[PDB]
Structure formats: structure tokens, C-alpha cells
Design a protein around this motif. Structure first.
Motif, PDB file in Angstrom:
ATOM      1  N   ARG A  30       0.833  -1.178   0.000  1.00 21.74           N
ATOM      2  CA  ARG A  30       0.000   0.000   0.000  1.00 21.74           C
ATOM      3  C   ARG A  30       0.887   1.256   0.000  1.00 21.74           C
ATOM      4  O   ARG A  30       0.617   2.225  -0.722  1.00 21.74           O
ATOM      5  CB  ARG A  30      -0.847  -0.025   1.250  1.00 21.74           C
ATOM      6  N   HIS A  36      -8.115   3.972  -1.673  1.00 26.06           N
ATOM      7  CA  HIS A  36      -7.960   2.522  -1.921  1.00 26.06           C
ATOM      8  C   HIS A  36      -9.318   1.843  -1.811  1.00 26.06           C
ATOM      9  O   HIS A  36     -10.065   2.088  -0.868  1.00 26.06           O
ATOM     10  CB  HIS A  36      -7.018   1.898  -0.896  1.00 26.06           C
ATOM     11  N   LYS A  61     -11.399  -1.953  -2.151  1.00 27.82           N
ATOM     12  CA  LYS A  61     -11.252  -3.392  -2.164  1.00 27.82           C
ATOM     13  C   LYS A  61     -12.115  -4.021  -3.245  1.00 27.82           C
ATOM     14  O   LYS A  61     -13.306  -3.719  -3.334  1.00 27.82           O
ATOM     15  CB  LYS A  61     -11.647  -3.947  -0.815  1.00 27.82           C
TER      16      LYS A  61
HETATM   17  C1  LIG Z   1      -7.419  -2.787  -1.029  1.00 28.77           C
HETATM   18  O1  LIG Z   1      -6.849  -3.954  -1.066  1.00 28.77           O
HETATM   19  C2  LIG Z   1      -7.588  -1.841   0.093  1.00 28.77           C
HETATM   20  C3  LIG Z   1      -8.831  -1.174   0.113  1.00 28.77           C
HETATM   21  C4  LIG Z   1      -9.089  -0.025   0.906  1.00 28.77           C
HETATM   22  C5  LIG Z   1      -8.065   0.460   1.756  1.00 28.77           C
HETATM   23  C6  LIG Z   1      -6.804  -0.220   1.796  1.00 28.77           C
HETATM   24  C7  LIG Z   1      -6.552  -1.375   0.990  1.00 28.77           C
HETATM   25  O2  LIG Z   1      -5.206  -1.837   0.934  1.00 28.77           O
HETATM   26  P1  LIG Z   1      -4.787  -3.117   1.749  1.00 28.77           P
HETATM   27  O3  LIG Z   1      -5.941  -4.163   1.670  1.00 28.77           O
HETATM   28  O4  LIG Z   1      -3.554  -3.656   1.013  1.00 28.77           O
HETATM   29  O5  LIG Z   1      -4.403  -2.738   3.159  1.00 28.77           O
END
Ligand SMILES: *C(=O)c1ccccc1OP(=O)(O)O
Length: 105
Positions: free
Chosen positions: A14, A60, A62
Motif C-alpha cells: 500500500r 484505496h 477493495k
Molecule cells: C485494497 O486492497 C484496500 C482497500 C481499501 C483500503 C486499503 C486497501 O489496501 P490493503 O488491503 O492492502 O491494506
């Protein structure tokens, strides 16, 4: 094949994704897809944003993948492939900070 996509950065952290995206030359919506650090089998869509309140910053999201075979950020809007998901969010902002514009340099 997800690994063949130029926007797929694979196993980068990240913090590394933020280092790449926090470049003043990157317009809003510059993005990359990577593996999640903590969630096995989930991907992460990292996106640059810019507003006068916060200036340049990174969000970020998911991306979940169903065993049944569907990809999504929100369960209400699913795609048959990661490529289709990226294509859809390049046209609609929906709940994202900005529509996807350019692959992270
Ligand atoms: C995506 O994988 C994600 C989504 C939102 C915030 C952080 C994030 O990253 P990590 O899952 O690698 O911590």
C-alpha cells in the motif's frame, strides 16, 4: 489474464502504491490494481485524487472476487472480469473519488 494488464502491479505494498500515485504530475483518476496486503484473494484499486481541501491524495478500494466468478467493489454492481470492472469505472464515477483515467506511470 489479469497479470498481462499494464494496470496490474501485482504484489506491491500500500505504501509503495501511495509513493507512485502521489506525484504532482498525476491527474485525478490515475490508478493501479494490486494484491491486497491483508485480504487473501482480494485485490486493491488504488486511485489518485485532488481537491482544494485535501490537495493530492490517494484512495484505496477493495475489489472482491466470488468463487462463483464475479468481480465487484459493491455487491450491487458486478462484472464477469476485472478488465470489465476497470472499463466500467473509467466511464462512471458512481461511488469512487473519480472515474479511472490513466494508468499509473
Ligand atoms: C485494497 O486492497 C484496500 C482497500 C481499501 C483500503 C486499503 C486497501 O489496501 P490493503 O488491503 O492492502 O491494506
Amino acid at each position: 489474464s489479469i497479470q498481462a494488464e499494464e494496470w496490474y502491479f501485482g504484489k506491491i505494498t500500500r505504501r509503495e502504491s501511495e509513493r507512485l500515485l502521489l506525484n504532482a504530475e498525476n491527474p485525478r483518476g490515475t490508478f493501479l490494481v494490486r494484491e491486497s496486503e491483508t485480504t487473501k484473494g482480494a485485490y486493491c484499486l488504488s486511485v489518485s485524487d485532488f481537491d482544494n481541501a485535501k490537495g493530492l491524495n490517494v484512495k484505496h478500494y477493495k475489489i472482491r472476487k466470488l468463487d462463483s466468478g464475479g468481480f465487484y467493489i459493491t455487491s450491487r454492481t458486478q462484472f464477469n472480469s476485472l478488465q470489465q470492472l476497470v472499463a466500467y469505472y473509467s466511464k462512471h464515477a458512481d461511488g469512487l473519488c473519480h472515474r479511472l483515467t490513466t494508468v499509473c506511470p
